[PDB]
Amino acid sequence: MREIVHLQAGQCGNQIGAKFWEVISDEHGIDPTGTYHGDSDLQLERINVYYNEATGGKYVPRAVLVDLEPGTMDSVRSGPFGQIFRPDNFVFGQSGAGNNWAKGHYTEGAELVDSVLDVVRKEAESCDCLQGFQLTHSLGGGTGSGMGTLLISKIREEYPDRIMNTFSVVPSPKVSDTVVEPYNATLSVHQLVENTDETYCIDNEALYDICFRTLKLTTPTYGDLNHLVSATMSGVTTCLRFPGQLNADLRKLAVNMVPFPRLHFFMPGFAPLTSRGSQQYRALTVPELTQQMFDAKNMMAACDPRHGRYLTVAAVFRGRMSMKEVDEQMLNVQNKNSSYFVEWIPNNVKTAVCDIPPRGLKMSATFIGNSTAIQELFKRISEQFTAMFRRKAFLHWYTGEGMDEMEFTEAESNMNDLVSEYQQYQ
Amino acid sequence: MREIVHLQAGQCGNQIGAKFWEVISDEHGIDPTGTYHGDSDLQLERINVYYNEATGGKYVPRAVLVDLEPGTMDSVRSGPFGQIFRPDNFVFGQSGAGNNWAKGHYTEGAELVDSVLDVVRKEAESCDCLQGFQLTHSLGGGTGSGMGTLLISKIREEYPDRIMNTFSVVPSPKVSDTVVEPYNATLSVHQLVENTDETYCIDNEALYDICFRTLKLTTPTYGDLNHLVSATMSGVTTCLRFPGQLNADLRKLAVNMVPFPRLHFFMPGFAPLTSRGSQQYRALTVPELTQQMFDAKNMMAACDPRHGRYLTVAAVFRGRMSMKEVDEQMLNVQNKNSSYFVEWIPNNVKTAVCDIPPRGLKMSATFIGNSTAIQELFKRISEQFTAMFRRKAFLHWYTGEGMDEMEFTEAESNMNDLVSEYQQYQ
Amino acid sequence: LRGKPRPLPISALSAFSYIPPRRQDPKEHSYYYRQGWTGIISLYDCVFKRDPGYNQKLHRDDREHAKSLGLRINEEECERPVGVLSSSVYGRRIDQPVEPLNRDHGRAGHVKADFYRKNDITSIKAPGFGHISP
Amino acid sequence: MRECISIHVGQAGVQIGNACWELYCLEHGIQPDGQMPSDKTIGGGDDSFNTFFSETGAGKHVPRAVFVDLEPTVVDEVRTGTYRQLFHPEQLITGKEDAANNYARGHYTIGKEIVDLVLDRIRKLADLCTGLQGFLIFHSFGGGTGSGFASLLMERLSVDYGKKSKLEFAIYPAPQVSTAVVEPYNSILTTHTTLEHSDCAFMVDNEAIYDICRRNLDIERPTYTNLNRLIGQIVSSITASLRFDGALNVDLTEFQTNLVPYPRIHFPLATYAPVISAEKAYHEQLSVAEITNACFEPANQMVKCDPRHGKYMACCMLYRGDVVPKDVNAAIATIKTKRTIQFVDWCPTGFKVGINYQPPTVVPGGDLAKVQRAVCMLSNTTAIAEAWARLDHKLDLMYAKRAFVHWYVGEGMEEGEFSEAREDLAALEKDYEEVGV
Amino acid sequence: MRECISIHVGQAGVQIGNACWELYCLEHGIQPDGQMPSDKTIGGGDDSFNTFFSETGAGKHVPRAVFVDLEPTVVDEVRTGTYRQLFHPEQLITGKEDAANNYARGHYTIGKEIVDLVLDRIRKLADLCTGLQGFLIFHSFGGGTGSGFASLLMERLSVDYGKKSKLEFAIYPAPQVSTAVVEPYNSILTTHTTLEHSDCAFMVDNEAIYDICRRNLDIERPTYTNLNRLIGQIVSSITASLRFDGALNVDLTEFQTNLVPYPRIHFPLATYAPVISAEKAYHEQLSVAEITNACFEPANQMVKCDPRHGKYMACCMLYRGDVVPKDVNAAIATIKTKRTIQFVDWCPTGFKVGINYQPPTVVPGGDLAKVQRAVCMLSNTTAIAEAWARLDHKLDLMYAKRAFVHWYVGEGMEEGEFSEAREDLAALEKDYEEVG
Amino acid sequence: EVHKEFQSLSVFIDSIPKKIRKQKLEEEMKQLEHDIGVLEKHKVIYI
Ligand SMILES: Nc1nc2c(ncn2[C@@H]2O[C@H](COP(=O)(O)OP(=O)(O)OP(=O)(O)O)[C@@H](O)[C@H]2O)c(=O)[nH]1
Ligand SMILES: Nc1nc2c(ncn2[C@@H]2O[C@H](COP(=O)(O)OP(=O)(O)OP(=O)(O)O)[C@@H](O)[C@H]2O)c(=O)[nH]1
Numbered sequence A, B: 001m002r003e004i005v006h007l008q009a010g011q012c013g014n015q016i017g018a019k020f021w022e023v024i025s026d027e028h029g030i031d032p033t034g035t036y037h038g039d040s041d042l043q044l045e046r047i048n049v050y051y052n053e054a055t056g057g058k059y060v061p062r063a064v065l066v067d068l069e070p071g072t073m074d075s076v077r078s079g080p081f082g083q084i085f086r087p088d089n090f091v092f093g094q095s096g097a098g099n100n101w102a103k104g105h106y107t108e109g110a111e112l113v114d115s116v117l118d119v120v121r122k123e124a125e126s127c128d129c130l131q132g133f134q135l136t137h138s139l140g141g142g143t144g145s146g147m148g149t150l151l152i153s154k155i156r157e158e159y160p161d162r163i164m165n166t167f168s169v170v171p172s173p174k175v176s177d178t179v180v181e182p183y184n185a186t187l188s189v190h191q192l193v194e195n196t197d198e199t200y201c202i203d204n205e206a207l208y209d210i211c212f213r214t215l216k217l218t219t220p221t222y223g224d225l226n227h228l229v230s231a232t233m234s235g236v237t238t239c240l241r242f243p244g245q246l247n248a249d250l251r252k253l254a255v256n257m258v259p260f261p262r263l264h265f266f267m268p269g270f271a272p273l274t275s276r277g278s279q280q281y282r283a284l285t286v287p288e289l290t291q292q293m294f295d296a297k298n299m300m301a302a303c304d305p306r307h308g309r310y311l312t313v314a315a316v317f318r319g320r321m322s323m324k325e326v327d328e329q330m331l332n333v334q335n336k337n338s339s340y341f342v343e344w345i346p347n348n349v350k351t352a353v354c355d356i357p358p359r360g361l362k363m364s365a366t367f368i369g370n371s372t373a374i375q376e377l378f379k380r381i382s383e384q385f386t387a388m389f390r391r392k393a394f395l396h397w398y399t400g401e402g403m404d405e406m407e408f409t410e411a412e413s414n415m416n417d418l419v420s421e422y423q424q425y426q
Numbered sequence C: 001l002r003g004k005p006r007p008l009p010i011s012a013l014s015a016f017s018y019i020p021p022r023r024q025d026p027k028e029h030s031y032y033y034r035q036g037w038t039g040i041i042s043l044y045d046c047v048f049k050r051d052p053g054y055n056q057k058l059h060r061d062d063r064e065h066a067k068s069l070g071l072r073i074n075e076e077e078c079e080r081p082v083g084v085l086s087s088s089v090y091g092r093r094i095d096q097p098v099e100p101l102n103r104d105h106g107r108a109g110h111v112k113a114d115f116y117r118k119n120d121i122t123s124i125k126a127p128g129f130g131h132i133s134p
Numbered sequence D: 001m002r003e004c005i006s007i008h009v010g011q012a013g014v015q016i017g018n019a020c021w022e023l024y025c026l027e028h029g030i031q032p033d034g035q036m037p038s039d040k041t042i043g044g045g046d047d048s049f050n051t052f053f054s055e056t057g058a059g060k061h062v063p064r065a066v067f068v069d070l071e072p073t074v075v076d077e078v079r080t081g082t083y084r085q086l087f088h089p090e091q092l093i094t095g096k097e098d099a100a101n102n103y104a105r106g107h108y109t110i111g112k113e114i115v116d117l118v119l120d121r122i123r124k125l126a127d128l129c130t131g132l133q134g135f136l137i138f139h140s141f142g143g144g145t146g147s148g149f150a151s152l153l154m155e156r157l158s159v160d161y162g163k164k165s166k167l168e169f170a171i172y173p174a175p176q177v178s179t180a181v182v183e184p185y186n187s188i189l190t191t192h193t194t195l196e197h198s199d200c201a202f203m204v205d206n207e208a209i210y211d212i213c214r215r216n217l218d219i220e221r222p223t224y225t226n227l228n229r230l231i232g233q234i235v236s237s238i239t240a241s242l243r244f245d246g247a248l249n250v251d252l253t254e255f256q257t258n259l260v261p262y263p264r265i266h267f268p269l270a271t272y273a274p275v276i277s278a279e280k281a282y283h284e285q286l287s288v289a290e291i292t293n294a295c296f297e298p299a300n301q302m303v304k305c306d307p308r309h310g311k312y313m314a315c316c317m318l319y320r321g322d323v324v325p326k327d328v329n330a331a332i333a334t335i336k337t338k339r340t341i342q343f344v345d346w347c348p349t350g351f352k353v354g355i356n357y358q359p360p361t362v363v364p365g366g367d368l369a370k371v372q373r374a375v376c377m378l379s380n381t382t383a384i385a386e387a388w389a390r391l392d393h394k395l396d397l398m399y400a401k402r403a404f405v406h407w408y409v410g411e412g413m414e415e416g417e418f419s420e421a422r423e424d425l426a427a428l429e430k431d432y433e434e435v436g437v
Numbered sequence E: 001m002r003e004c005i006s007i008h009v010g011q012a013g014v015q016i017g018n019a020c021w022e023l024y025c026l027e028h029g030i031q032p033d034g035q036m037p038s039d040k041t042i043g044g045g046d047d048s049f050n051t052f053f054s055e056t057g058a059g060k061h062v063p064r065a066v067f068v069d070l071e072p073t074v075v076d077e078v079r080t081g082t083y084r085q086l087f088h089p090e091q092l093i094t095g096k097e098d099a100a101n102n103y104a105r106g107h108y109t110i111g112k113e114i115v116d117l118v119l120d121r122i123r124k125l126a127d128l129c130t131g132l133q134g135f136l137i138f139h140s141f142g143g144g145t146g147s148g149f150a151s152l153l154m155e156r157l158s159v160d161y162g163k164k165s166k167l168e169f170a171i172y173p174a175p176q177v178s179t180a181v182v183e184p185y186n187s188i189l190t191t192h193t194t195l196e197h198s199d200c201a202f203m204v205d206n207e208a209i210y211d212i213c214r215r216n217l218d219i220e221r222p223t224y225t226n227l228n229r230l231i232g233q234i235v236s237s238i239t240a241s242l243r244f245d246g247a248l249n250v251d252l253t254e255f256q257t258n259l260v261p262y263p264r265i266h267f268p269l270a271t272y273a274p275v276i277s278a279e280k281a282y283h284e285q286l287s288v289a290e291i292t293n294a295c296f297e298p299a300n301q302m303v304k305c306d307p308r309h310g311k312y313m314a315c316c317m318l319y320r321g322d323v324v325p326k327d328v329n330a331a332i333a334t335i336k337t338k339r340t341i342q343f344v345d346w347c348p349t350g351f352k353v354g355i356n357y358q359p360p361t362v363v364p365g366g367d368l369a370k371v372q373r374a375v376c377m378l379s380n381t382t383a384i385a386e387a388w389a390r391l392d393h394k395l396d397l398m399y400a401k402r403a404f405v406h407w408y409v410g411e412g413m414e415e416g417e418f419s420e421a422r423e424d425l426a427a428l429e430k431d432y433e434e435v436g
Numbered sequence F: 001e002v003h004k005e006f007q008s009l010s011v012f013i014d015s016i017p018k019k020i021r022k023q024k025l026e027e028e029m030k031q032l033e034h035d036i037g038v039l040e041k042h043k044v045i046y047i
């Protein structure tokens, strides 16, 4: 009833979406061939939130999978549910970004977005009402941080009233697979602030800590990190497509959350994550779910919430419970953690209750949170940028394509004011 | 009872007409040997529009096919459906033209024109009420544009009230088959504007573009191009042969289409074109058919309409349907891109609906539209004429058969007068 | 061996994520208490056989379940014990009454049903046929 | 006795007649074969089928109409349709090389050779009519053969049959949507011949019936079948008084003598109130106030207009089924107490009520449910003139550029016919702007 | 003929109205599809159902209510629920968008376009009815579509229907437990609208009935079903005397003439005393003398407000069931001797009693036991000045640095209404303080 | 089966053997489609 168009960029976005359309696929219960094979009719009413249809019960996802290489779309087709995606939205390039922001935004990707815009505009005008524009990309890559940022900057000149959420995969602070990553990081950060509505930061090493301490896996493959993140992906927008006692779409998840235009950076969480050795030794109710959110050990950002103060918090509940204890323990976590919330806002947590759980899970919930610890995630990139630009290193890869030097100074200058306005709320 | 006589000049138009009569034979359901085998009754009710009756129930076509060399009639005789054509409906010349207007117009085509006029008058008084004549030929050929245009000239004196529509084959923009193509094409374009009431521009470059990008065919041959043209040729004569809620014959598709005398240059398209690997992912409902027409890449003339501006637009639909959805979506496509339509005429779209779709489909459409963008189809040929005639290069091939010098200048003057007349309505 | 997508190295398969074409145990497997739809036996019927009909109550043809036209949700939780939604409790146990309702204290209207007749003017008319008096 | 001859000219007329005559066969006991069976009679002189059905001594009732078109497509379709044995073969008129959205065919030697045959048809059809009451016209402005040939038919009809009642159920161009590009002038120069040669003019607007079907019946696929069923319903309810008993019977004479004050003001509106699906029929009770209050809503109009901005002039209530007159009177008294409904000064009464005892009949597999109360308002107002203002503006936008004129004047006519085609419409617009003030 | 019109705005209104209309169809013999197994011919004529139902000619009587919401996610499951054959499809107004916790969205962008439909159906319902008494508006202060759309509705029914009865069954946000950060925004600016387009406004607050369920009803972890049923019981006891017979009958006209002393002091309360399960009341009698004592204690009110710091001004007692008026007379004879419940000096009587002869029908599965006597007090007190002081204090706390204004200014608003909606609350505070 | 083979092919084609493989899948599709159509044309089949 509320159309969501799934935008993509790069190998990060393609790999994440390959299991987004696993979790959503089995939540509504489709076959790998696109036919509905669920059990009840609750999953059949709201298929159009994420899916277009056809005749014969054939459902295709409404996604725009795009990168600059044809070597990754064939990897997407080789997955378990790769045969539901369409070839029309298989937009590909010929050359690679190669982990630089210049050739993803002005030279190569500037031509390729002239057709991605055509595919999106064909898809956006093929419905009743778009809710907005979700996208998954990497700020540390070349074709995600470059072409996805350009796609974000190009879309909002046509639909100025929609709500976009960037489920960005921020660079890790410890392990850096690319040396020139803090160039693309700032050169995307300068662009997401003035355009995007709410930004979701996902960090890889925090996900590894989740899979180690909260799950007790031995060898965590990427199919666990991407599945966890896809679980919270489905859990953010669960109230749109399933009924409940108190629903929350993406529009009211931001008017309840953002206080200011320049301050919109969020960081999510997921509650019912437990190991396989200690799952029968705990009763699952509202108390253990409310306890598990508000510790730093279940957070998917690389910042300690103890060092900052939450301005505001959202919370979405799925399944069938009684919500009196829900309000009791939100009030309880306000009562104990008074030092971890600002004192110039009366109420800080949104409570939203759905009525349907995932497949294989029965009482699940999803954390979405604005914090004053994200600037810790930003000053490290800032200090690396100041320490490495000062020797003027790696400039030939960022000047020879027609770029300038003043854009780097603007990227440096935009960070400090944002850090200062975040730090003024401490 | 409103019958139509088909004229065929050259081997280009004969190659198009072989597949045209192939598609008409298939959709009216008559044998390779000329016996009706269609299951329904609606395919027999108005069968005389294309097939005169004969002895033994044989439905002999009423087609006039003339060529200046006897080479290419062996192919159309030894085709699949080549055994239904009447044996004496072929008139051949001993010596062919070979890319010159003079041998088709004054030397050999002038002596041979009495026989084609003879068979045209013989097959034109065997019908009840003639609607008009149809001619397919090549502008860049020698005996298409040389002799079949003389047929236009003679029939315009013989029947000054009937409707003339030409499915002309304009030279391609980038690669040209013949170096003397502009001479033979302008020397017929200059005369065509006086003796014709409709003109359709087909180029093989945009047809290759369609057969590559749209249908995703492996090796596009000229048979596929002929089939793509023949779909448009069979589309325009739908309601003459089939019933429907809103008919449109050839005559209503001309008064509704061109306001002035010398602006009858149309530029067509075809709706249900989907890839073989993308058949199951989309349905050919109302918006998916009405969107493909107003896209640039589905069009059979190699001019982008966004450079120009439409004057009037047609749409001839088939299959069981209603008019709320189509007359909402044509107004949506007429009100969104209002900058793509002139404002001095309020309505621009003509809508016809028949009830019988072609076999294998259930909903079809046929684009017919004049535009200011057809001017650029003639700008390149006029500049080619001016670039080559000023060097007096290829004059001796024409003057040796008794031409005149300033007749080339008069053709250029009429060409540029059409230029000055088309550009005012931008 | 027709074509296999070189399935996977064992370093990629992990211990959390595996979702098959779920067949479900008989009856007792889901939160929804049902078996699961059998589905279309062959996609050729879905792909090469589409009956052309604009089925009279749905805005487009690609929205076959617009106003829940065909979804039988209300019947479906009349076969399972617990309503899956927190709106099926509203009017569930009304086929079994707790107390028969009284029908003595009401608001019966007598001045608008006994004072007014329909139409005869019978005051100026003789009695007629079948006029037994007390 | 009270025979009515109906004229359908143009393929729009054939398509409307193909549903209206189905309703006329269902409202009596007339099968598609054309013989009333023994179990649906009264047992003597019925005299209710005699209005539209003649009587041949072999028990066959033939329709009292003509289906005239210049292309044999729709006429051949009704010739191969289910009602082929109903109409006689001479009652259907075909032609070759149709008018093709052009008025220039209207006054040409091909348009002058076929009006004699249809006039012969009318002459021999009306000669069987002892009590012929008038002619009902079905044609379309936007087409060629609906606007051009029917103009000549009405001209020669007014010449021959003299001062007679002629009412048209004509299709007007819609305000946003259109079909043909040459529809403006084909409607403008056929409006010129319906001012001196007509008595009333019922206009319809295809997108109005579209939006009505959407807002009231929850219906996709409004084809011409679903529109022509409602057009059949209104033409049945206007002639309902001539056929069945009621309290007050409205002849066509007492409709014109009550509804058109001047010879130049004959332009009613139209509304059919109880349009409601079968599903919604059980929930909404159809009482007389709650059915007559929907006709004054501008969202229920049959011609896209706003009567709030204009002023009403006269009305004609055509009630049907079981009707109690005192609820009609009470609602009419209530109707007079809305300030939104403004009335002109020289019509203090401004109402006319007809009551008929026959309930509406429902076609099988159709649109409406079994409804027993009906309202048909034919409300003349000055607010119908805004369509003429848009048409005059939309013709002035095309002229002074000589667009589509060469086919008009090259075919036998004169270019001077356009010059007075705006002068008389300016006169008509100033007439409608002078009456309401 | 004593008809009333109920307006449910927002999904708070829809979920309250589901239970209230459940109690309506169960308090008569009305089947869930809307049919009468015992019509007016059998067992004498009846008209008690005419106050909430419109009997059609075929017996399928339809309710007289409108349910309006912008998001259709809460009306779609009742479009295909257990009550899906009762309501007319056009009494279910659904939009496309969502107001999304914003006063600006539901009042200045999406409010302006669907109002012409709900007014059309309300006018059709008013023409349907011959003897309407007033309006019964169900909406919530803290929402976006229950605060913007509701206030925009009242500002236009005031100019349409003129002097009628407007009785608010409004949900008040709590002092301690809240759901939205933006809750003090839509709960203040809509008070700048309601103060002239309203006549009476009962506040009902959620943790009040949570405490009632956890203390008196002895239900641990209740749900939203165990709240809207009590609200429906309150609402049906309010309109009880309008549709049954007793010693003293109360119409909706005398609520505003007995509980509203001034145009700006029109904010009363609600209390339901005999809320007790079938264990606790199983072997203890419930007389009239102590179901009137339990109501005056703060552990049974439906808003957190301490009347010991307040001054009662006007209360009305809609009693219900097998009660004879001499025990009522003794009941108010007992409580006027209590100093802890103190009245204002100027009001001598300050009391109003109506009696009905109907015991409260019990919904199956509802934990309210079968009781014989039911008292519905609507106290009007000046203690609600305590409730608004903290709301203005937190509004002053968060507006001090102009929080959330940038998304509240682009959607058809400006800073002027934000500035002037605080002076109105200060005037309300001083108006409630000069009387007490 | 042969459609599932088709959907697994490369998104863009540049090499010769992929073209030949795609053509062979195409003609096998046409053979299967033709047999299915000739068997679904009528209700009674002579053998
Ligand atoms: N409501 C309604 N409108 C129709 C119907 N048929 C045609 N129209 C309208 O009438 C207009 C005229 O179209 P046609 O009837 O096809 O044209 P024509 O009157 O037959 O004249 P020719 O084209 O020369 O044959 C069209 O624009 C349609 O919108 C119908 O059955 N019902
Ligand atoms: N007691 C009770 N409270 C409810 C009910 N439904 C919602 N509420 C409360 O009302 C408060 C405000 O919610 P709403 O007014 O419904 O917000 P809204 O109407 O959705 O506004 P939008 O989000 O813009 O559409 C919530 O915090 C809920 O706690 C209900 O059925 N019963």
Ligand SMILES: Nc1nc2c(ncn2[C@@H]2O[C@H](COP(=O)(O)OP(=O)(O)O)[C@@H](O)[C@H]2O)c(=O)[nH]1
Binding pocket: A009, A010, A011, A012, A015, A016, A097, A099, A138, A140, A141, A142, A143, A144, A145, A169, A176, A177, A178, A204, A222, A225, A226
């Ligand atoms: N969580 C997660 N991270 C990924 C995945 N694939 C790549 N990454 C991270 O993305 C970072 C660089 O992305 P990159 O390869 O440059 O993306 P590209 O621009 O599309 O090529 C690496 O540090 C990886 O850790 C994935 O599937 N899941």
Ligand SMILES: Nc1nc2c(ncn2[C@@H]2O[C@H](COP(=O)(O)OP(=O)(O)O)[C@@H](O)[C@H]2O)c(=O)[nH]1
Binding pocket: B009, B010, B011, B012, B013, B015, B016, B097, B098, B099, B100, B138, B140, B141, B142, B143, B144, B169, B177, B178, B204, B222, B223, B225, B226
């Ligand atoms: N689309 C298409 N074009 C054709 C075909 N055959 C010939 N032509 C065109 O005809 C032109 C050459 O015509 P030509 O042989 O000189 O005609 P001739 O003088 O009669 O022999 C070329 O430019 C082709 O584009 C055909 O089968 N299909």
Ligand SMILES: [Mg+2]
Binding pocket: D010, D011, D069, D070, D071, D098, D099, D145
């Ligand atoms: Mg015609």
Ligand SMILES: [Mg+2]
Binding pocket: E010, E011, E071, E143, E145
């Ligand atoms: Mg809501």
